[PDB]
């Protein structure tokens, strides 16, 4: 139920990575999704791969 | 007529087959990806369609 | 390291989470580009039956 300007995330210098697996990230501002689901967690650095 | 119609209808249905691309519609590959990632995906559809 | 995984549900069904696109008036009976909910193409749009 919202509008997602992804550039707010994609231009952020905080991220150690911005990995994409079914899109290229600028297109997130053009697409439309039925839902998004954010799985969220904290993990050691040598297993973030 | 039946042999031609079975030959055309199969040729048309194969446009909707993936060949291992992320979509069988080209405008989905173009809208969801940048060109460096698109040329890996479109070549699947070209290799298949051809 | 904090991690978030944004899983997407593509347009199999009525879309909701949109990109920040300023939508437009709609042409009919003329050749046009279209983008409905990210479903892009080129065509002539008319009333159905």
Written overview of the protein:
The structure is cut from a larger assembly and holds 3 copies of chain A. The first copy, chain A, is mainly beta and 49 residues long. Helix content of chain A is 8%, strand content 20%. The first copy, chain A, is built from 1 helix and 2 strands, in the order αββ. Chains in contact: A-B, A-C, B-C. It is classed as viral protein/hydrolase. Keywords: viral protein, VIRAL PROTEIN-HYDROLASE complex. The entry is titled "SARS-CoV-2 Spike Glycoprotein with two ACE2 Bound". Chains A, B, C: Spike glycoprotein.
Largest interface, per-chain counts?
A-C, 28 and 24 residues
Q: What is the approximate shape of chain A?
A: globular
**What is the count of DSSP helices of chain A, taking H or I runs of 4+ residues?**
1
Radius of gyration of chain A: 13 Å
Strand content of chain A: 15-25%
Question: What's the story with the biggest beta sheet of chain A?
Answer: none
**Which structural category fits the helices and strands of chain A?**
mainly beta
Number of strands of chain A: 2
Give the proportion of residues in helices of chain A: under 10%
Oligomer: part of a larger assembly
N-to-C span of chain A: 32 Å
Report the order of strands and helices of chain A.
HEE
PDB class: viral protein/hydrolase
Keywords: viral protein, VIRAL PROTEIN-HYDROLASE complex
Entry title: SARS-CoV-2 Spike Glycoprotein with two ACE2 Bound
Chains A, B, C: Spike glycoprotein
């Amino acid at each position: 139920n919202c509008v997602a300007d992804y550039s707010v995330l994609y231009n952020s210098a905080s991220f150690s990575t911005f990995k994409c697996y079914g899109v290229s990230p600028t297109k997130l501002n053009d697409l439309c999704f039925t839902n998004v689901y954010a799985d969220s967690f904290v993990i050691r650095g040598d297993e973030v791969r | 007529v039946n042999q031609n119609a079975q030959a055309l209808n199969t040729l048309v249905k194969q446009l909707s087959s993936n060949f291992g691309a992320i979509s069988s519609v080209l405008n989905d590959i173009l809208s969801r990806l940048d060109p460096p990632e698109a040329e890996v995906q479109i070549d699947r559809l070209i290799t298949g369609r051809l | 390291y904090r991690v978030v995984v944004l899983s997407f549900e593509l347009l199999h069904a009525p879309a909701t989470v949109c990109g920040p696109k300023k939508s437009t008036n709609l042409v009919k009976n003329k050749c046009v580009n279209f983008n409905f909910n990210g479903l892009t193409g080129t065509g002539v749009l008319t009333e159905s039956n």
